[PDB]
Design a protein around this nucleic acid. Structure first.
Ligand SMILES: [Mg+2]
Ligand SMILES: [Mg+2]
Ligand SMILES: [Mg+2]
Ligand SMILES: [Mg+2]
Ligand SMILES: [Mg+2]
Ligand SMILES: [Mg+2]
Ligand SMILES: [Mg+2]
Ligand SMILES: [Mg+2]
Ligand SMILES: [Mg+2]
Ligand SMILES: [Mg+2]
Ligand SMILES: [Mg+2]
Ligand SMILES: [Mg+2]
Ligand SMILES: [Mg+2]
Ligand SMILES: [Mg+2]
Ligand SMILES: [Mg+2]
Ligand SMILES: [Zn+2]
Lengths: 49, 308, 217, 115, 108, 153
RNA sequence: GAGCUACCUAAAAACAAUUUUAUGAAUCAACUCGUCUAUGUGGCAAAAUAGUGAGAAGAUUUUUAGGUAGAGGUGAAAAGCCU
């Protein structure tokens, strides 16, 4: 009966594993958006080349 | 290389011989120290009686710490614990060689290892047949009070009610400023003071065009020999050779101190009652109680004080 | 097994012999006078002989707000309010003019310091001088009183909300808005509790000390 | 510890203090070579435009062990001749006042409670 | 504060050639018995240590290849085996790292 | 005056000191042999010793888990501490870490360096300082003295 | 020589949230300015930094191009500004 902590990468570190974990954080804010406008707004709000 | 090289006691010893040498060196400490336990049966020097104006030897002790203490009047006295530890008489000079009117006895306490010491010090002790001691000190002793070298000294050499003087090196404070070294006021915090808060003010006057010798300036504070005068002895523990001395003693805990009868005017010839040459336990004239107290002291295990 | 705190040595470079010498003296006084078991927050009545009179006795009853000291110099503070005037006396357990110590009410409180009771309402500080002792159960654990006191206006003796005090006995919700509680958390040092070289483990020392105390009996 | 300009609580029943006034009394002088004032030390108050002598009977600063620390700086008013201005003191007074060098028997007589 | 006078080479030569400012000769330099290279008495040999770390890097490279990714540290003991060696009974149930080279003489 | 203080001042401050030591400890647990500056390795050695003590307490201990969680930033190491390192050091009462000084860093800062490792690891053995043999001239004379002393009472 | 700065012409921009109202109104960002103190004083800087402050839908601020030239220009006059 030992509650080992989940083996996941840190959220704040400066690595590739930690970046891919901050990507799922915003991606989850789309999953959890009720309306389709919010989903499309989140997916397109940030402009890049 | 055909040049100087460094060595220490452990460099060439094997794993087994490392333990063997440690046990051997400690073995020698045991036998040597038990040889000198009986001064009076080893050709003791003649024991002269006390005459007025005599000064007897003192002891070197280690500073254990402090504790509270109470008197039958209910007052609380902070007291310091001094342990007499491997204290032996080491060297004797006569009045002529010391160049003083009085003679000198060098005592030493707190036996130490033999492994990082100069050959000179080790030879000095090998002649005397003692393990090396941490520190030497010199005591001024009159001719009647001379004691043969190699004679151990014990806390019972002092008795409750006598006043004593302790000298030891003070705690070092490193390089310090002028406020903490000499208690200078300093300068204001605000109202326009620019980069001058803890600084010394004007060194001197404009006329003399120099700084007087002995002007107080920033420097290294502490680590100096200081002495405290007129400290009462409240109690002596004969089993552990502990002396209870009123008030504070210079130095840190585990610091070696020099204990000798007080030189203040009041207690000029108080050593009449005390063992004049020294306290000999080998004589065994009467066996001392484990704890010696001063009459005013309220001993623990006594009934609670009721100022009826 | 309740080992009185004063027996536990503080860490440092002082010799163990200095402690052994003191313990023997401490045990000697305890035989003459019995020092009851008590904790911070328990109410005590201490009868001491006054030195300003002819051995006449004085009595003071209060809650033990603080316990501190090692060896024969250990002390405990206890507060009360008399005719609407708070007073605190810092008694010395081994002072030879303490005639008797009676634990009127034995209990434990959420914190081991109750200095904040200076800023709490007077009710939490006032205790009846004439109150009779309450029963105790030896083969039981001491009760832990979980009372959370109510404070008077914010200007306090100290900043009890700050994380260094770690007070768990004050109703911070009533007296402080969440904005203040958030701001006060800017003085929090989360690493302190998790650095292993700052913890002084006394289990072995307590075990050896407990055996010696019983052996002397 | 009471100093110059400290704020004090008169613990008599005398009219000079008893009467509620928007300003408390403030210490103007401490009768010592040391500027600090402790239990049993006289001080000169400025109370309602009047300069009046007084005696400290308690303070918030810690003292030696086995003495009582109060929550307020308590003071009693004494006349120029030294007789207390007020006739009663209902607040506890420490018993150390008896043995301190000085004249405190008059104040002790007026005090019913001692701590 | 600025200099009132230029400082002479004779004054400067005393300051910067004072013994306090000279390089102190070292008495703690000795030879390593195995390699015959120089070392200080209280520090490890920098040549023998260099052998160990180069082998250590090779082993750590092999460990990474076996794991294949981050956060794959085993919960069981590890052991290193060289060509011509097979796990013993005591070696059962322990991660095994295999090295192409023969067992080094120092490594035991 | 810094008499009696048992810590070095490292990093940007007190919190920065812990995090710097925490990363070194995390590396030591994963790799079991680490190179760092002598001062930093000396500072981290104490935490390396105590961490193993917490592992010995056991997996089910909650205080050990919280402490292990804080210090090991990579959470895969938590099973390693409780199930690999702690079982290894069951017999010992202490002295789990071996720390030695290696030549100065050849990087223009000439830092004083040290290699810190846990005892019993799988890596190639370090070239430790080995004492002389009993067959040497000085040792034999000491060995000769030992035999006589024991045999003759 | 008006790519700085003073003033002007033409063509363009920016001002969230909150309360008032219907505003050279209010609180306060972005933005504009530079009150007080400390640091700095061959400095990060030939006028800055860090705090603290004033204005912040207007006589506001900003961008681009053009104009006025030394016996002169510009000036909500400080004999200010015109690299
Ligand atoms: Mg000052
Ligand atoms: Mg300043
Ligand atoms: Mg002159
Ligand atoms: Mg205060
Ligand atoms: Mg010269
Ligand atoms: Mg220092
Ligand atoms: Mg140090
Ligand atoms: Mg223009
Ligand atoms: Mg707006
Ligand atoms: Mg406006
Ligand atoms: Mg404003
Ligand atoms: Mg305004
Ligand atoms: Mg203008
Ligand atoms: Mg004008
Ligand atoms: Mg110009
Ligand atoms: Zn080598």
């Amino acid at each position: 009966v030992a509650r080992y902590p989940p083996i996941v990468a840190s959220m704040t570190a400066d690595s590739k594993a930690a970046r891919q974990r901050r990507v799922q954080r915003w991606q989850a804010t789309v999953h959890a958006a009720p309306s389709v406008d919010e989903k499309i707004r989140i997916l397109t709000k940030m402009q890049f080349k | 290389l055909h040049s100087k090289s460094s060595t220490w006691w452990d460099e060439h010893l094997s794993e087994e011989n490392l333990s063997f040498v440690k046990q051997l060196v400690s073995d020698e400490n045991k036998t040597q120290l038990t040889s000198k336990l009986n001064p009076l049966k080893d050709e003791p020097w003649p024991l002269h009686p006390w005459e007025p104006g005599s000064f007897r030897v003192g002891l070197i002790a280690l500073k254990l710490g402090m504790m509270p203490l109470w008197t039958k009047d209910g007052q609380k006295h902070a007291v310091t614990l001094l342990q007499v530890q491997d204290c032996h008489v080491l060297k004797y000079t006569p009045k002529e060689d010391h160049n003083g009117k009085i003679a000198a006895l060098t005592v030493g306490g707190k036996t130490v290892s033999r492994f990082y010491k100069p050959d000179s010090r080790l030879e000095f002790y090998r002649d005397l047949g003692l393990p090396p001691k941490q520190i030497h000190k010199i005591f001024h002793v009159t001719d009647n009070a001379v004691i043969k070298p190699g004679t151990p000294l014990y806390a019972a050499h002092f008795r409750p009610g006598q006043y004593v003087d302790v000298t030891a090196k003070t705690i070092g404070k490193g390089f310090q400023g002028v406020m903490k070294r000499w208690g200078f006021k300093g300068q204001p915090a605000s109202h326009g003071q620019t980069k001058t808060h803890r600084r010394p003010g004007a060194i001197s006057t404009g006329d003399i065009a120099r700084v007087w010798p002995g002007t107080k300036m920033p420097g290294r504070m502490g680590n100096q020999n200081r002495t405290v005068y007129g400290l009462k002895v409240w109690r002596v523990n004969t089993k552990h050779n502990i002396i209870y001395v009123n008030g504070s003693v210079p130095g840190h805990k585990n610091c070696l101190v020099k204990i000798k009868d007080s030189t203040l005017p009041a207690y000029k010839d108080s050593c009449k009652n005390l063992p004049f040459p020294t306290y000999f336990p080998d004589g065994d004239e009467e066996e001392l109680p484990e704890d010696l107290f001063d009459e005013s002291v309220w001993q623990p295990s006594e009934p609670s004080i009721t100022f009826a | 097994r309740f080992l009185s705190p004063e027996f536990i040595p503080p860490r440092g470079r002082t010799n163990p012999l200095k402690f052994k010498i003191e313990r023997k003296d401490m045990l000697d006084r305890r035989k003459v006078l019995p020092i009851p078991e008590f904790y911070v927050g328990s109410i005590l009545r201490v009868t001491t002989a006054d030195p300003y009179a002819s051995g006449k006795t004085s009595q003071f009853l209060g809650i033990c707000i603080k316990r501190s000291g090692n060896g024969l110099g250990a002390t405990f503070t206890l507060r009360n309010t008399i005719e609407g005037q708070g007073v605190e006396i810092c008694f010395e357990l081994y002072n030879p003019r303490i005639q008797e110590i009676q634990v009127v009410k034995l209990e434990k409180r959420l914190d081991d310091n109750l200095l904040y009771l200076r800023d709490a309402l007077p009710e939490y500080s006032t205790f009846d001088v004439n109150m009779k002792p309450v029963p105790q159960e030896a083969c039981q654990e001491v009760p832990v009183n979980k009372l959370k006191v109510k404070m008077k206006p914010k200007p306090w003796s100290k900043r009890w909300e700050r994380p260094n005090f770690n007070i768990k006995g004050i109703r911070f919700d009533l007296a402080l808005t969440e904005e203040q509680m958030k701001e006060a958390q800017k003085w929090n040092k989360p690493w302190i509790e998790f650095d292993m070289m700052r913890e002084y483990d006394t289990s072995k020392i307590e075990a050896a000390l407990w055996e010696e105390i019983e052996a002397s009996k | 510890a009471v100093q110059k300009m400290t704020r004090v609580r008169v613990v008599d029943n005398s009219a000079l203090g008893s009467t509620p006034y928007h300003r408390p009394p403030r210490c103007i002088h401490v009768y010592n070579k040391s500027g600090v004032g402790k239990v049993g030390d006289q001080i000169l108050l400025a109370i309602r435009g009047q300069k009046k002598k007084a005696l400290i009977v308690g303070h918030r600063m810690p003292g030696s062990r086995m003495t009582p620390k109060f929550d307020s700086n308590n003071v009693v008013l004494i006349e120029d001749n030294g007789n207390p201005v007020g006739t009663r003191i209902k607040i506890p007074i420490p018993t150390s006042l008896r043995r301190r060098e000085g004249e405190y028997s008059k104040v002790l007589a007026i005090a019913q409670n001692f701590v | 504060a600025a200099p009132k006078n230029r400082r002479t080479i004779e004054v400067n030569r005393c300051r910067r050639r004072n013994p306090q400012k000279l390089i102190k000769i070292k008495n703690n330099i000795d030879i390593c018995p195995e390699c015959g290279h120089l070392k200080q008495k209280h520090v490890l040999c920098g040549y023998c240590y260099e052998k160990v770390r180069q082998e250590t890097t090779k082993i750590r490279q092999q460990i990474g290849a076996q794991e294949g990714g981050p956060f794959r540290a085993p919960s069981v003991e590890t052991m290193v085996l060289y060509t011509g060696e097979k796990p013993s009974e005591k070696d059962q149930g322990k991660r095994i790292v295999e090295r192409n080279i023969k067992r080094p003489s120092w490594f035991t | 005056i810094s008499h009696g203080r048992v810590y070095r001042r490292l990093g940007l401050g007190p919190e920065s000191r812990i995090h710097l030591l925490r990363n070194l400890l995390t590396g030591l647990v994963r790799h079991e042999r680490i190179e760092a500056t002598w001062a930093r390795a000396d500072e981290m050695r104490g935490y390396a010793e105590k961490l193993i003590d917490y592992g010995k307490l056991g997996d089910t201990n909650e205080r050990a888990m919280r402490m292990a969680d804080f210090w090991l930033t990579e959470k895969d190491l938590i099973p390693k501490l409780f199930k690999v390192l702690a079982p290894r050091f069951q017999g010992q009462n202490g002295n789990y870490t071996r720390m030695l000084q290696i030549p100065n860093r050849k990087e223009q800062d000439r830092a004083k360096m040290a290699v810190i490792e846990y005892k019993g690891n799988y890596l190639p053995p370090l070239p430790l300082p080995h004492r002389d043999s009993n067959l040497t001239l000085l040792n034999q004379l000491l060995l000769g003295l030992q035999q006589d002393l024991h045999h003759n009472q």
